[PDB]
Amino acid sequence: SMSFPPQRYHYFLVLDFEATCDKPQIHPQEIIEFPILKLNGRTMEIESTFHMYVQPVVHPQLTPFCTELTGIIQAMVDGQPSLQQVLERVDEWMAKEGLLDPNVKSIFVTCGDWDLKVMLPGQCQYLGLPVADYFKQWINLKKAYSFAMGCWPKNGLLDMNKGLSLQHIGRPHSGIDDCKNIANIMKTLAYRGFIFKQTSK
Numbered sequence: 476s477m478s479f480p481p482q483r484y485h486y487f488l489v490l491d492f493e494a495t496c497d498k499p500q501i502h503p504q505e506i507i508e509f510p511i512l513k514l515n516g517r518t519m520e521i522e523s524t525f526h527m528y529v530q531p532v533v534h535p536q537l538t539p540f541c542t543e544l545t546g547i548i549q550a551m552v553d554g555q556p557s558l559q560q561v562l563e564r565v566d567e568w569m570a571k572e573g574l575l576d577p578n579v580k581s582i583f584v585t586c587g588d589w590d591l592k593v594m595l596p597g598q599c600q601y602l603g604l605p606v607a608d609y610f611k612q613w614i615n616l617k618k619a620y621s622f623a624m625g626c627w628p629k630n631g632l633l634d635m636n637k638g639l640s641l642q643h644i645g646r647p648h649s650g651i652d653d654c655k656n657i658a659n660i661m662k663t664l665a666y667r668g669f670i671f672k673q674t675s676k
């Protein structure tokens with residue numbers, strides 16, 4: 476096939492939350508890291524980065540497990556805006572990037588469905604906040620990978636990097652680093668000729 480074919484979107488918006496957690500799981504979970512990488516729709520190159528840590532409210536003190544898992548320390552979320560304000564910052568960032576133009580086509584890309592099917596809508600429902608329409612469609616990279624490679628990856632980014640012989644970027648369970656791996660996997664899948672499609676229902 477053709478390497479780096481024409482794609483259906485002008486930009487891809489790579490997103491990977493980190494959230495409060497514990498062993499056994501904390502309830503409710505709350506977003507504590509909100510990264511978005513804006514990728515050129517054709518080349519998959521990173522052109523802009525949104526990144527904010529978020530101050531949790533229901534369980535404001537990060538557990539030892541959460542800090543061990545994510546590397547996020549208490550001082551990184553203390554003094555930060557809450558999710559409501561971060562969502563307003565995202566909307567302003569989308570506007571300045573030119574992504575609110577109806578003729579500019581973009582879609583979010585996540586590893587799995589959890590981030591936009593479960594985490595964001597669930598916390599927004601808890602807080603009584605509407606979900607912006609652009610969060611309601613996305614590409615699940617694991618499903619896209621399964622069509623591009625003909626196989627179901629077992630453990631997310633690590634196994635997709637393994638299958639494509641890519642070196643892992645940065646630290647697992649860091650939101651921004653997970654985004655960098657998603658973007659690197661996407662670049663390789665496009666190099667192999669894959670055309671990305673919405674997977675969310």
Ligand SMILES: Nc1ncnc2c1ncn2[C@@H]1O[C@H](COP(=O)(O)O)[C@@H](O)[C@H]1O
Nearest residue numbers: 491492493494495496497545648649653
């Ligand atoms: N092994 C785990 N045990 C408990 N919670 C987890 C685990 N892995 C991920 N999580 C939660 O899911 C969020 C997203 O995970 P990830 O995108 O894989 O870093 C984390 O920030 C945690 O809140």
Ligand SMILES: [Sm+3]
Nearest residue numbers: 491492586653
């Ligand atoms: Sm993740």
Ligand SMILES: [Sm+3]
Nearest residue numbers: 491648650653
């Ligand atoms: Sm992650």
